[PDB]
Design an enzyme around this catalytic site. Structure first.
Site, PDB file in Angstrom:
ATOM      1  N   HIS A  81      -4.149   3.667  -3.197  1.00  0.00           N
ATOM      2  CA  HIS A  81      -4.313   3.272  -2.366  1.00  0.00           C
ATOM      3  C   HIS A  81      -3.296   1.975  -1.547  1.00  0.00           C
ATOM      4  O   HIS A  81      -2.739   1.773  -0.614  1.00  0.00           O
ATOM      5  CB  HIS A  81      -6.032   2.992  -1.896  1.00  0.00           C
ATOM      6  CG  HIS A  81      -5.809   2.000  -0.444  1.00  0.00           C
ATOM      7  ND1 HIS A  81      -6.161   1.837   0.509  1.00  0.00           N
ATOM      8  CD2 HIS A  81      -6.092   0.462  -1.126  1.00  0.00           C
ATOM      9  CE1 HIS A  81      -5.896   1.281   1.657  1.00  0.00           C
ATOM     10  NE2 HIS A  81      -6.564   0.283   0.630  1.00  0.00           N
ATOM     11  N   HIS A 133       0.827  -1.333  -0.168  1.00  0.00           N
ATOM     12  CA  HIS A 133       0.245  -0.249  -0.191  1.00  0.00           C
ATOM     13  C   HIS A 133       1.149   1.102   0.106  1.00  0.00           C
ATOM     14  O   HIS A 133       1.500   1.537   1.274  1.00  0.00           O
ATOM     15  CB  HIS A 133      -0.938  -0.155   1.063  1.00  0.00           C
ATOM     16  CG  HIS A 133      -1.916  -1.039   1.660  1.00  0.00           C
ATOM     17  ND1 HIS A 133      -1.216  -2.209   2.023  1.00  0.00           N
ATOM     18  CD2 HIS A 133      -3.385  -0.944   0.915  1.00  0.00           C
ATOM     19  CE1 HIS A 133      -1.988  -3.013   1.912  1.00  0.00           C
ATOM     20  NE2 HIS A 133      -3.111  -2.634   1.263  1.00  0.00           N
ATOM     21  N   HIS A 193     -29.148 -13.519  24.355  1.00  0.00           N
ATOM     22  CA  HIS A 193     -28.429 -13.409  25.453  1.00  0.00           C
ATOM     23  C   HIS A 193     -27.305 -14.976  26.404  1.00  0.00           C
ATOM     24  O   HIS A 193     -27.009 -14.865  26.804  1.00  0.00           O
ATOM     25  CB  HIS A 193     -29.285 -12.531  26.735  1.00  0.00           C
ATOM     26  CG  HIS A 193     -29.869 -12.233  26.375  1.00  0.00           C
ATOM     27  ND1 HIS A 193     -29.897 -11.092  25.918  1.00  0.00           N
ATOM     28  CD2 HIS A 193     -29.024 -11.031  27.221  1.00  0.00           C
ATOM     29  CE1 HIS A 193     -30.912 -10.156  26.424  1.00  0.00           C
ATOM     30  NE2 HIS A 193     -29.508  -9.283  27.335  1.00  0.00           N
TER      31      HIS A 193
END
Ligand SMILES: Cc1ncc(C[n+]2c([C@](O)(CO)[C@@H](O)[C@H](O)[C@H](O)COP(=O)(O)O)sc(CCOP(=O)(O)OP(=O)(O)O)c2C)c(N)n1
Ligand SMILES: Cc1ncc(C[n+]2c([C@](O)(CO)[C@@H](O)[C@H](O)[C@H](O)COP(=O)(O)O)sc(CCOP(=O)(O)OP(=O)(O)O)c2C)c(N)n1
Ligand SMILES: [Ca+2]
Ligand SMILES: [Ca+2]
Lengths: 675, 675
Positions: free
Chosen positions: B259, B25, B476
């Site tokens: 990029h 990059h 949960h």
């Protein structure tokens, strides 16, 4: 007034439900009953037709407050009664401790995990905008509905809601109206201890409209006016700040103690007497309230009746769109849509499964209008956009249109996952997908698990599945990820090996009505396999290479199936005969008949699994497992495979060791069990 | 000027590294080189002592830009050379494609997964504030260091950064200075497609200070001045907006193409010639740059030398604190601290393991000053605060002090996880913990995995581990969660059954230096076991009930160990003799000797596992597995256990079936394998 009596009824039903269970959350129901009353009076819905496609949607993002939602549903005559309320939080009831769309009529989505519901609301609103843009015509407002969301401080603290709220503001979603229960109390106490940000300033920074209601404990006129104001702002989602007292009316109002435990019996008595109810009575429903609510239902039913005639007239005026819309509302894909799926032969070139996925999408998106999807800022790496399609954007931006097909989610995996759930929840046969790297699906686990629990047919296009991605290294390379999602109930986890298996994976993902899919796809090229087909791969697991005198069977997925085929050849030189099984989806395989499964994984032969990530789960299908149970490495992918001995010779060595280990032993299929 | 030459050197080293790897990059390194040069000139650090406790810390949250970080480290003479840069992204190098703290000298944390690094910086800054409050005295600024973070648009889109930024603003963390690379480009293209929020307005809403640098491609004077300005604002973290051109200087500057892929060779030539470098040369390091950077190192080393004398003088002036500080900097816990761990007998009362955890914390927090921790808005449910301690808050709030011990994370599990990593990364022997429900540890998976990869001794206090929580229901109740984290390399997942096992779990968690811990704890009461001890549980797995003539061994964890003991009694009435193994941590068990493990799970006897969640992983330790592979239910917990047959009789039935299934078969330990 009757409105006051309705609000008291809602409050007291919720408190009485919590009292009967001796469990649950009375505080937010008490604080939000005025707003719930006001919102439901503005909403269009039919308690007798929960699937009317032009209904307004409501989402309780603060799902612990569900005694409030259940009370509204009961009062409005959904398929939920006072007897169900008396069974709040009891095993097997229609009134579980957090709302579940599979179990509760009128629950659009499953909430309880904070932050999810508001994001689901963003997705319902996104879908409504796309749907309206696709079908509405002059004089034919087929879709014009709103999305109303209640949320609390906890949802506002969860990062997923920030992601979705930034995106919703960018997308100018004017039919989204959210209400913040601004009660300044969470479990740890005052929000002053942890949550002192200027929420309103933050929402303005996302491009939302704001309405503030300073006395939401009583001012239903202002709440109704806030809705009307929000409806005039067609290019911004609205946040309505409801300043409330948690537990309003309780002796313990305004405290964290009223958030999450039943009120004291004497507190409930004084609540009743202050509001004109009998303190000796529980679950009271004054007939005046029922009458008032029934009036609104009857009006809404007349609105739906007129919508049905609008729809009939639409089918005459717009015959093509009308037939498409009918089909989607019937839950049916286009006839023979799957004829568009690409088919390969072993003579075709090697292709990465991310690229095969691109090709599938490019063939099926034109054939199936209810497919929409996007990527979390990885469009040119996941390969998720069909060339020639338009992005879903407000037209005012010049960057797309609401009739567009492709969503730029930004770097927002968790919100993408929860938005996908909302798009599915909208209905109309939407088959929607979201791309990211497999390793970063993990950022969205909160939402993915809810896709499974909620039974939504969403699809993750999860590329870069392994060490095969190479140089980006161990922060990007999945190890645990497949095991995590395969261990979750109701997730199909497809890891296709080649072109035909990739088409089977999409066939499954698009045909799904109750099971989310994750498609684990490669960066690196893989050969087309001798023996693969859509037909065989659609069984989830199949015999790729049959060997009637096998010394061993190698079961593999994805990129490791070709490796197993190459290992079979090495083994032949060692005098060992192997068969190969490809197992592109363990869930689909598990659902086949016992006899089919035994035809793939028979008794009497050792079975070795090969997959370059965790060995968890694999003993369901194998006696020995060759996997990768350590983190990866940054380097050229073939060198990483060689380092970890995922080579034809390394697989052959372990296969030969497996044959030797079982010499003189009686081997039965891994599919057998004691119970 | 020499500064200009340094910036060009940094840019060209980064580009040349990407070119040599043909991977990586170059864009953000080109854009951020001016800021990196300016920040590192302001920072105090010793390349020859990466652990100096009063160093400023730097974090590259946009970890893909690591060619920039590696270039800085090389130029400053860390243990990283140009030869290492030439091996960027190559297998086994010191320059992996994203920074790893275990491998890269000067990498404080592991980044690459977007959003994590800024949150890690919040935790480094939190730790520094707590550390300074604990040790600094008049004339003794033992700790006065800053935390500098670079981050990009991707980190700002990830919800975890919003969580941490809200919290950091609340905590008034004035020694945190973050820099946004405002380059308006991400992978999908312009930020206009997905990220149009007013970031600066959002950060103001969190209580951050802002400095804007409009020409960060060249204006290092303004960047330095922004740092000085931030240092004057002692009660707010600062965000410095660096408006840059991605890929500055490239022919392809300002595009998404720069990029994430190597530049073209002719582009690199024109970069060199424009900046006065030889286009035929790669990896140039002008000696003027080395000389300039060496001057700054020499000055920093003199600062550390004076700090060492300050520390010696502190030990004389403050003998008690000075000895404590010395011990912590040596990485040693207090001598015999573990004598504070609670010890139980089988005559003691049944206790939930969440409550046993509270009791442990209340005994060890006073004994071990480097323990700090908190909860994600679940303090009264996780039971994570020792009575009498003060919260970590800015004193200006009146709600705590920076010398406090207990952190109110709010509903922010993911940021809590990444903040914990930053606190551990600070050093000074911090042993820090974070409470939530086990099912919501999943919200933080991005950070948890990095705890493992980074080798940080953080601890999750993960209560409400199963269907035993009851009425809150399936949203949960964990099913997949243990399997997910056990399948991740380097995570100890303790599921203690009783008081002694809970103390062993904490002993492990606090003694850890390289392995994160998750402690899976119960809501419901469990009996004290006959045969448990800290000593035996510290082995991770142990024989609880030895039966020399066993027909079966039942291996279990947590709440299911008592169930197995009760099943043993039912089995005796059926004429079946069982042994029981308790396996409180699979990782610790796996690390014991082969002979120890075989003493627990011997050959020649069927072994059945029992644990009320996924069966994945359990075949490592058992021949048959009784688990829960479906979602849970909302009801009273004992009724849910009965529904799923997790009862003494249900376990006995499956044990009897297991004995029958192996009649006439030769059984070897699950610990045996072919390779
Ligand atoms: C992603 C996520 N994280 C944490 C939670 C936990 N949580 C929740 C629950 O799990 C319920 O969903 C708990 O209330 C739970 O039921 C009890 O703690 C159980 O008590 P115990 O008797 O077992 O000890 S609610 C909650 C925060 C509430 O803050 P809000 O401001 O959103 O709600 P409020 O205005 O106070 O009613 C928080 C933080 C969640 N539901 N979802
Ligand atoms: C949590 C998370 N999600 C997504 C990403 C992916 N991602 C990233 C990477 O994975 C690198 O960490 C990719 O660049 C990756 O290397 C390539 O896509 C690989 O290409 P290919 O040849 O294999 O096709 S970077 C990134 C967004 C960049 O936006 P920023 O604005 O932060 O950075 P910038 O100013 O443009 O340099 C994004 C979105 C991440 N690193 N972490
Ligand atoms: Ca609240
Ligand atoms: Ca950027």
């Amino acid at each position: 007034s009757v409105d006051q009596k309705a609000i008291s009824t809602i409050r007291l039903l919720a408190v009485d439900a919590v009292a009967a269970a001796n469990s649950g959350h009375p505080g937010a129901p008490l604080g939000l009953a005025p707003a719930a009353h006001a919102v439901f009076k503005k909403m269009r819905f039919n308690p007798k037709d929960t699937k009317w496609i032009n209904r307004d949607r409501f989402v309780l993002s603060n799902g612990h407050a569900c005694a409030l939602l259940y009370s509204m549903l009961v009062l409005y005559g959904y398929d939920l009664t006072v007897e169900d309320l008396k069974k709040f939080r009891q095993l097997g009831s229609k009134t579980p401790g957090h709302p579940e769309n599979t179990d509760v009529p009128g629950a659009e989505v499953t909430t309880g995990p904070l932050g999810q519901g508001i994001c689901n609301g963003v997705g319902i609103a996104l879908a409504q905008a796309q749907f309206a843009a696709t079908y509405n015509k002059p004089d034919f407002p087929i879709s014009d509905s709103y999305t109303y969301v209640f949320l609390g401080d906890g949802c506002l603290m969860e990062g997923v809601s920030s992601e979705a709220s930034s995106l919703a503001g960018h997308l100018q979603l004017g039919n989204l109206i959210a209400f913040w229960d601004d009660n300044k109390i969470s479990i740890d106490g005052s929000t002053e201890v942890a949550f002192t940000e200027d929420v309103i300033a933050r929402y303005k920074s996302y491009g939302w409209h704001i309405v503030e209601v300073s006395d939401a404990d009583t001012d239903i006129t202002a709440i109704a006016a806030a809705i009307d104001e929000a409806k005039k702002v067609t290019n911004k989602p609205t946040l309505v700040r409801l300043t409330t007292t948690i537990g309003f009316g309780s002796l313990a109002q305004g405290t964290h103690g009223v958030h999450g435990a039943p009120l004291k019996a004497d507190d409930i008595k004084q609540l009743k007497t202050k509001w004109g109810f009998n303190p000796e009575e529980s679950f009271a429903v004054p007939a005046e309230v029922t009458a008032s609510y029934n009036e609104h239902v009857a009006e809404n039913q007349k609105i739906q009746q007129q919508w049905n005639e609008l729809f009939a007239a639409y089918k005459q005026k717009y015959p093509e769109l009308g037939a498409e819309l009918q089909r989607r509302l019937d839950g049916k894909l286009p006839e023979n849509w799957d004829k568009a799926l690409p088919v390969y032969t072993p003579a075709d070139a090697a292709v990465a499964t991310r690229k095969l996925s691109e090709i599938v999408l490019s063939k099926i998106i034109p054939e199936v209008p209810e497919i929409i999807g996007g990527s979390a800022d990885l469009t040119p790496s996941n390969l998720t956009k069909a060339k020639g399609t338009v992005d879903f954007q407000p037209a005012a931006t010049g960057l797309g249109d609401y009739s567009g097909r492709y969503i730029r989610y930004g770097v927002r995996e968790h919100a993408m996952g929860a938005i996908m759930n909302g798009i599915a929840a909208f209905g109309a046969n939407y088959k929607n997908y979201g791309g990211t790297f497999l390793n970063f699906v993990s950022y969205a686990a909160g939402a993915v698990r809810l896709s499974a629990l909620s039974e939504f047919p969403i699809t993750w296009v999860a590329t870069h599945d392994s060490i095969g991605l190479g140089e980006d290294g161990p922060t990007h390379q999945p190890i645990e990820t497949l095991a995590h999602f395969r261990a979750t109930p109701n997730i199909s986890v497809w890891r296709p090996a080649d072109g035909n298996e990739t088409s089977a994976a999409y066939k499954s993902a698009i045909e799904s009505t109750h099971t989310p899919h994750i498609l684990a796809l490669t960066r690196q090229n893989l050969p087309q396999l001798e023996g693969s087909s859509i037909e065989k791969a659609s069984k989830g697991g199949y015999t790729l290479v049959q060997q009637d005198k096998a010394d061993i069977i190698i079961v593999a997925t994805g990129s490791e199936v070709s490796l197993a085929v190459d290992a079979l050849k090495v083994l032949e030189g060692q005098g060992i005969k192997a068969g190969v099984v490809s197992l592109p989806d363990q869930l689909t395989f598990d659902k086949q008949s016992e006899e089919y499964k035994l035809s793939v994984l028979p008794d009497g032969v050792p079975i070795l699994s090969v997959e370059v990530m965790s060995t968890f789960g694999w003993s369901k299908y194998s006696h020995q497992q060759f996997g990768l149970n350590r983190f990866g490495a940054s380097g050229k992918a073939p060198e990483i495979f060689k380092l970890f001995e995922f080579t034809p010779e390394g697989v052959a060595e372990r296969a030969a060791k497996t044959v030797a280990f079982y010499k003189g032993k009686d081997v039965v299929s891994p599919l057998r069990s004691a119970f």
